Amino acid sequence: MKVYRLYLKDEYLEMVKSGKKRIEVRVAYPQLKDIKRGDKIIFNDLIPAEVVEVKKYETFRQVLREEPIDKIFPDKPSFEKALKRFHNMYPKWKEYRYGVLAIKFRVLGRDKE
């Protein structure tokens, strides 16, 4: 079991604390994509989390197809809104989207199944 200390914002972290944050979508890339089931993820280096399952895919639609949006995102936007949202972040640096990794983690602490 490995530990991955990921620094997040109180805003986003909050969601993780609540549990709303279950599926973390973000460009695979190394140092993260390497992550796997059984490992542990420390958000904001305070709240530990266990890797439930790791799955790789392509096209946000894919992750949106397999994984929900209400989970991936707290605002629980619309499929169309999510598409734009993903194509909104950083306008200046506009370019074809990429990286489709669905990270499934289970916050340690609260009571669950």
Side-chain angles (χ1 to χ4, degrees):
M1 175 153 126
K2 274 125 197 159
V3 172
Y4 279 54
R5 288 190 259 196
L6 314 189
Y7 251 102
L8 264 36
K9 221 191 204 134
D10 231 359
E11 292 251 59
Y12 320 155
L13 164 76
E14 247 189 84
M15 282 103 172
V16 178
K17 244 275 162 167
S18 27
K20 269 217 246 67
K21 226 148 216 81
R22 241 87 132 67
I23 301 119
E24 183 50 39
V25 60
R26 226 170 156 158
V27 286
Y29 232 57
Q31 213 286 119
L32 302 131
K33 80 175 197 142
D34 236 326
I35 204 117
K36 47 147 183 250
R37 187 250 181 171
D39 270 352
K40 162 144 87 167
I41 297 168
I42 328 305
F43 291 111
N44 288 57
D45 321 349
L46 234 176
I47 293 132
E50 161 153 321
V51 184
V52 191
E53 198 91 283
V54 75
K55 242 103 219 193
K56 176 159 136 119
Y57 275 120
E58 71 203 84
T59 319
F60 70 78
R61 70 89 135 85
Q62 175 42 68
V63 160
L64 266 47
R65 278 248 242 180
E66 236 229 47
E67 291 72 37
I69 284 132
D70 51 285
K71 292 204 219 150
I72 299 173
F73 244 43
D75 256 23
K76 55 173 198 152
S78 300
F79 205 94
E80 232 117 62
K81 231 181 204 255
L83 161 271
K84 218 176 285 279
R85 272 294 103 182
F86 262 42
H87 291 236
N88 209 300
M89 248 92 111
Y90 304 112
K92 277 104 199 205
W93 243 245
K94 51 138 129 136
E95 251 271 275
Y96 82 110
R97 241 227 113 61
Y98 175 69
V100 175
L101 202 310
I103 278 184
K104 309 159 88 251
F105 80 70
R106 238 157 98 162
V107 61
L108 308 138
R110 200 164 181 73
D111 39 42
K112 232 83 220 95
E113 181 148 78

